[PDB]
Design a protein around this nucleic acid. Structure first.
Ligand SMILES: [Mg+2]
Ligand SMILES: [Mg+2]
Ligand SMILES: [Mg+2]
Ligand SMILES: [Mg+2]
Ligand SMILES: [Mg+2]
Ligand SMILES: [Mg+2]
Ligand SMILES: [Mg+2]
Ligand SMILES: [Mg+2]
Ligand SMILES: [Mg+2]
Ligand SMILES: [Mg+2]
Ligand SMILES: [Mg+2]
Ligand SMILES: [Mg+2]
Ligand SMILES: [Mg+2]
Ligand SMILES: [Mg+2]
Ligand SMILES: [Mg+2]
Ligand SMILES: [Mg+2]
Ligand SMILES: [Mg+2]
Ligand SMILES: [Mg+2]
Ligand SMILES: [Mg+2]
Ligand SMILES: [Mg+2]
Ligand SMILES: [Mg+2]
Ligand SMILES: [Mg+2]
Ligand SMILES: [Mg+2]
Ligand SMILES: [Mg+2]
Lengths: 211, 52, 95, 147, 204
RNA sequence: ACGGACCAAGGAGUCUAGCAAAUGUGCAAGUGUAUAUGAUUCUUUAAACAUUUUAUACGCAUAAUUAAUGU
RNA sequence: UUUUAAUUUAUUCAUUGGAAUUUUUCAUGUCGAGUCGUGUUCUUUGAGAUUGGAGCACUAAUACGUGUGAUACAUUUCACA
RNA sequence: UGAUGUUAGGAGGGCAAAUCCGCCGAAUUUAAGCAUAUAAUUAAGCGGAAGAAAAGAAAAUAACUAUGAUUCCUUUAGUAACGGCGAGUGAACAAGGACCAGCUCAAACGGUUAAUCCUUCGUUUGGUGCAAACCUUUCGACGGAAUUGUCGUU
């Protein structure tokens, strides 16, 4: 090497030519994918090809203020809507047997989601012109007139999407309510200087409770 | 020997593409420029040429 | 660090019990089989050695029993559990 | 484009620009970063001084999402508000804005620059520095800690 | 039931009863051929835990495998190469002895059948002894049963030479998950190939 | 001192990755619509067009310094 | 010519079995062994007082157990499976 | 319980390899010499499958307001780490997308009655073809396997 250049680094020392891959057909493949998932819709004959998913928080102090879709409601969230895990699968509702509800906010949020979904679907009978009640929490069957006059509406696919955050980032306050004797930096530093002995005292509380 | 991993295409910024399309519509409305491209329009009335 | 199950969190980023402030939410057949199997099989040789070392009854013999069990099983924990079990057996045999 | 390459200017010349006496040979000084510390020492020392040796402690499994922390100074703090909204607060005198910077992607407020005189402001964040918090207090504001 | 008592007894192996039984069992296995058929499982409780069933097409075989390490295959023990590659007398094999036992009976002697599992029945200074469960995929008893007829499909031919039995899962690294077995699925070579790849946009 | 008996055709600084300097272009405290999805896109089109009906995907930049708790 | 969506039409009578929740009760079971693990030798990995595999020697506990939480120990707390 | 049987009915063997699964296993070359290292968990050698194969329903992450079987694409990132700490090498979690699916044994419970399964021989309903053939059908008899454990519940 000879000049003021960065020191070289390239990792090309094996037989690298045997596996190089140029992507000549990315748009062709998305056309194919679109046509396949469009063909499925005509085979369903009215029912949508999407399934309902819950709303959950992301796991880290980097993302904990965001929500997204998860893979399925819990047992308790389904029982809050009077549904059974087995019966729910026969509708586009996903079930997760291993997520837990640690707080009330998530429980109520997902129960309201399930209740809203359960109110906006019409049931078609298994045998034509034979309408019966539900089972396992499934809504009762519909009559042929409602089925005729809802087949001509546009299905709503916005219920399958994650909620969108509308929390604002500023507000207004009155000058008479400002607190003046609060010290943020000092509180932050005293909180860190105190942790170790507090952990010790919690451990001793745990020992006392066990016996 | 020629290879298939020659870089065949390019990527173009969106703003420059839009700017160029806009500047190419504007040139379509000048009588002198249209004539100099090779179109025989000595009998047209208006060069923008809107029709019902 | 540690948190508390009771006593909700403080809305501060650092310290003990920190973070956002959501609302928190809260055999007899076996020893029949044991007796049958025990009288079928008995004790193992290293178990017999541990038994006699315990039966001596001094503190040096106790430390020796721990070392021998730790060697035979290959783990401090395992060896400690084995010595405790043999101690219970020796106590029960004397009654 | 091969139309504009330098080698086409040497096309009738003998040595293609590399020299009669010193040829163009293949690897006459080593391969890659070969001779550093022996016969490439001067280049290494004047262009990359601290290159050889090691210093510091090891950190075996890092997990960078635990310490991620973007910052913002107090200069850019009135600029998060629209100008017509900034106008209204400077006019009226018994109201102040409450700004939550975590909703904008910042975690720690930092203290470079100058806040406007006698214009109270209330700021929410996860961490504060000492100087920033002093400057916010001086003009009549308040800092709030959130998680 | 009865099986729990057998299971608890076989956990000792050093009591006088089990020592006597093991000695007599292993004496007899030496006098028999290297690969011979048994009429019944000698450990019925252990055979139930693996997929054995008392149905017309299940059979049992017994194999004998030699112990230790195999020497590197070079004439007169001479290596032409670098000193890092001159080793011999402590080369160790990727496969278990249980897998080799399965392969001794599964390749040619009973190419008619399919290997399911196997289990330990004793050992010695020269040999280890195993019993192997096999299934016949052409008998109608297994071919009509909905629970077990997955074995009759041709994608399950010679499981014991492609690493697909339990012993094969052990030595490929598929018995541990997470951060201790990060680069082993869907296979070692496939994971290597994925990480060597250079992918390259048309427009870049 | 070495190559050259003669004539015709062929015959040698290129391609990819990664960095920098120079220069042209667009926007500017920001900038780049990734993988995907959409469309009354579908010989050409493997191109072109679009972006999810007080708005947190990711990179580089907007802040440094220390082995480090950190500041 | 294929295969598939709607749409069009049931009815009156017969028998035996099953299945989900909702009420009152009792019963607190089972859960994969020469296997896991430890020592030692050789390989392999980014894995470092050892990441996976293998040979030899020793050889467990019973859910109040066992395993993981990237530095070797002893005494413990907590989370996850 | 071994053996015997030209007894009745059946299976395995060879070819082919771009993609796929398992084992075995170099040196050239780079380090401006060379022995660890690199080339490379590669080439050559030996076995086994499919229209895909392999993997796969937690003895998994995290440390948060928590996520949630496998696979692949964009990033993480030439980063944490390994190394005659030289030449060189090099992952994982979170985040955005494609697709989307869950189940069976073993063990527990059922003894006024193994409920279970297979070979052979019959016979009985509706459809489709010119024909050849092919769907659908619940009844029985003799024989055998199985309590050293088939089937049902969960
Ligand atoms: Mg010249
Ligand atoms: Mg020359
Ligand atoms: Mg010279
Ligand atoms: Mg050699
Ligand atoms: Mg070897
Ligand atoms: Mg010469
Ligand atoms: Mg001559
Ligand atoms: Mg020529
Ligand atoms: Mg420039
Ligand atoms: Mg278990
Ligand atoms: Mg190596
Ligand atoms: Mg961790
Ligand atoms: Mg060399
Ligand atoms: Mg050289
Ligand atoms: Mg040499
Ligand atoms: Mg090969
Ligand atoms: Mg073959
Ligand atoms: Mg498969
Ligand atoms: Mg990736
Ligand atoms: Mg970067
Ligand atoms: Mg190493
Ligand atoms: Mg390597
Ligand atoms: Mg994702
Ligand atoms: Mg059972």
């Amino acid at each position: 090497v000879a000049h003021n250049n960065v020191l070289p680094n390239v990792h090309l020392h094996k037989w690298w030519q045997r596996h190089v891959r140029v992507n000549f057909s990315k748009n062709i493949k998305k056309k194919k994918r679109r046509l396949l998932r469009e063909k499925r819709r005509k085979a369903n004959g009215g029912t949508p090809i999407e399934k309902l998913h819950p709303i959950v928080h992301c796991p880290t102090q980097r993302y904990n203020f965001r929500t997204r879709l998860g893979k399925g409601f819990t047992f308790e969230e389904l029982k809050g809507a009077g549904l059974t895990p087995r019966a729910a699968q026969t509708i586009g509702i996903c079930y997760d047997k291993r997520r837990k509800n640690r707080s009330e906010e998530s429980l109520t949020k997902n129960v309201e989601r399930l209740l809203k979904y359960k109110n906006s679907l019409v049931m078609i009978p298994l045998k034509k012109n034979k309408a019966k009640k539900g089972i396992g929490g499934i809504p009762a069957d519909a009559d042929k007139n409602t089925i005729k006059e809802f087949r001509n509406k546009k299905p709503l696919l916005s219920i399958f999407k994650k909620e969108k955050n509308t929390k604002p980032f500023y507000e207004t306050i009155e000058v008479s309510k400002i607190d003046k004797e609060f010290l943020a930096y000092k509180t932050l530093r005293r909180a860190k200087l105190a942790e170790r002995r507090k952990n010790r005292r919690q451990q001793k509380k745990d020992i006392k409770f066990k016996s | 020997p020629t290879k298939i991993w020659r870089r065949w295409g390019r990527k173009v910024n969106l703003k420059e593409k839009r700017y160029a399309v806009c500047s190419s519509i504007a040139a379509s409305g000048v009588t002198s420029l249209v004539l100099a491209r090779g179109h025989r329009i000595s009998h047209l009335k208006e060069v923008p040429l809107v029709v019902s | 660090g540690r948190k508390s199950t009771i006593k909700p969190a403080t809305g501060i980023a650092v310290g003990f019990n920190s973070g956002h402030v959501v609302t928190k939410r809260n055999s007899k057949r076996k020893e029949l089989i044991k007796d049958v199997v025990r009288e079928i099989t008995g004790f193992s040789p290293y178990e017999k050695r541990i038994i006699e070392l315990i039966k001596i009854g001094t503190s040096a013999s106790t430390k020796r029993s721990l070392k021998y069990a730790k060697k035979k099983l290959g783990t401090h924990k395992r060896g400690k559990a084995k010595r405790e079990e043999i101690q219970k057996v020796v106590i029960l045999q004397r009654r | 484009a091969t139309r504009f390459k330098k080698n086409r200017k040497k096309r009738g010349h003998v040595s293609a620009g590399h020299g009669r006496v010193g040829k163009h040979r293949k690897h006459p000084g080593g391969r890659g970063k070969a001779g550093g510390l022996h016969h490439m020492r001067i280049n290494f020392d004047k262009y990359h001084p601290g290159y050889f040796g090691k210093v510091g402690m090891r950190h075996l499994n890092l997990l960078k999402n635990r310490t991620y922390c973007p910052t913002i100074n107090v200069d850019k703090l009135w600029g998060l508000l629209p100008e017509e909204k900034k106008k209204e607060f400077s006019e009226n005198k018994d109201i102040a804005p409450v700004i939550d910077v975590t909703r904008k992607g910042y975690f720690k407020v930092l203290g470079n620059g100058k806040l406007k005189h006698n214009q109270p402001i209330v700021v929410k964040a996860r961490y504060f520095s000492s100087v920033a918090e002093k400057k916010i207090k001086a003009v009549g504001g308040q800092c709030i800690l959130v998680a | 039931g009865a099986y729990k008592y057998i299971q608890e007894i076989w956990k000792k192996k050093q009591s006088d009863a089990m020592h006597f039984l093991l000695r007599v069992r292993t004496w007899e296995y030496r006098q028999l051929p290297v690969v011979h058929r048994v009429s019944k499982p000698s450990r019925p409780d252990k055979a139930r835990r693996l997929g054995y069933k008392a149905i017309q097409g299940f059979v049992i075989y017994r194999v004998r495998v030699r112990r230790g390490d195999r020497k590197k295959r070079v004439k007169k023990g001479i290596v032409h190469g670098k000193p890092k590659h001159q080793g011999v007398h402590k080369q160790k094999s990727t496969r278990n002895l249980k897998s080799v036992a399965e392969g001794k009976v599964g390749k040619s002697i009973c190419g008619n059948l399919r290997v399911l599992n196997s289990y330990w029945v004793g050992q010695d200074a020269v040999y280890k002894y195993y019993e192997v469960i096999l299934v016949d995929p052409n008998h109608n008893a297994v071919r009509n049963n909905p629970k077990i007829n997955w074995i009759c499909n041709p994608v399950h031919k010679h499981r014991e030479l492609r690493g697909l039995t339990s012993a094969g899962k052990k030595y490929r690294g598929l018995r541990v998950k997470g951060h201790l077995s990060a680069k082993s699925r869907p296979s070692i070579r496939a994971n290597w190939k994925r990480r060597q790849l250079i992918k390259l946009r048309k427009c870049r």
